[PDB]
Design a protein around this ligand. Sequence first.
Ligand SMILES: N=C(N)NCCC[C@@H](NS(=O)(=O)Cc1ccccc1)C(=O)NCC(=O)NCc1ccc(C(=N)N)cc1
Ligand SMILES: [Ca+2]
Length: 223
Amino acid sequence: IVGGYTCGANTVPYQVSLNSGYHFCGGSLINSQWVVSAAHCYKSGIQVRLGEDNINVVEGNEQFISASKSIVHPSYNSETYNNDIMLIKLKSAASLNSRVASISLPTSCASAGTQCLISGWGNTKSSGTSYPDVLKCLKAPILSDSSCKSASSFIITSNMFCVGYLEGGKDACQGDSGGPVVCSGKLQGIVSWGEGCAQKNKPGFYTKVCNYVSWIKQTIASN
Ligand SMILES: N=C(N)NCCC[C@@H](NS(=O)(=O)Cc1ccccc1)C(=O)NCC(=O)NCc1ccc(C(=N)N)cc1
Ligand SMILES: [Ca+2]
């Protein structure tokens, strides 16, 4: 997260860190047994870390739980990031409390101008590299599709939406991949892709979760 602020320990209780020996992606806890992340975050040997603030220190509210199963979207296409969503089932149910809590799926898509919260342990520099140990947060509006249309040479599909700033300096970034964009108490986005980070007139692109609610519920129900 570039140009954000320190969230405060456990103020984002649905935020998870995916760990394969080190943090490599964010994700969102959607019930006591399942996490939603990005398809591009797919790897073998995922440990899900809940209740995290400082990812380098055991502070006492962490729960580490191995994934039993990962399910990349059936139609995920890595060269376009189309359908960039994956579900991860936990080997055991999380113990829910005030620091480890699920986030609701949306009932409808959110409208442009709505304020959302993006969070993660990703890069904090638009040029160069600094990875934070505590969770970072960024308040960011949904932009009109029209506002972001001309921002890339790469295809932008209807399974993607635009969130962030045209003025530059405020954005999600590498290492934020898979993490939440939450708007009015609903998981509307998944950190997916963008051209660099925090560049002028180059906002980020996020998996449009409101298109996936049927697939998510059905997949959870059958697994
Ligand atoms: N098919 C498409 N759309 N290709 C373009 C996206 C590739 C890549 N962008 S990039 O940051 O690595 C560097 C880049 C690549 C091509 C052109 C300009 C700049 C990228 O984002 N790859 C995945 C990735 O790195 N995701 C992490 C991430 C998280 C947040 C942002 C953000 N600025 N909101 C960017 C990347
Ligand atoms: Ca910790």
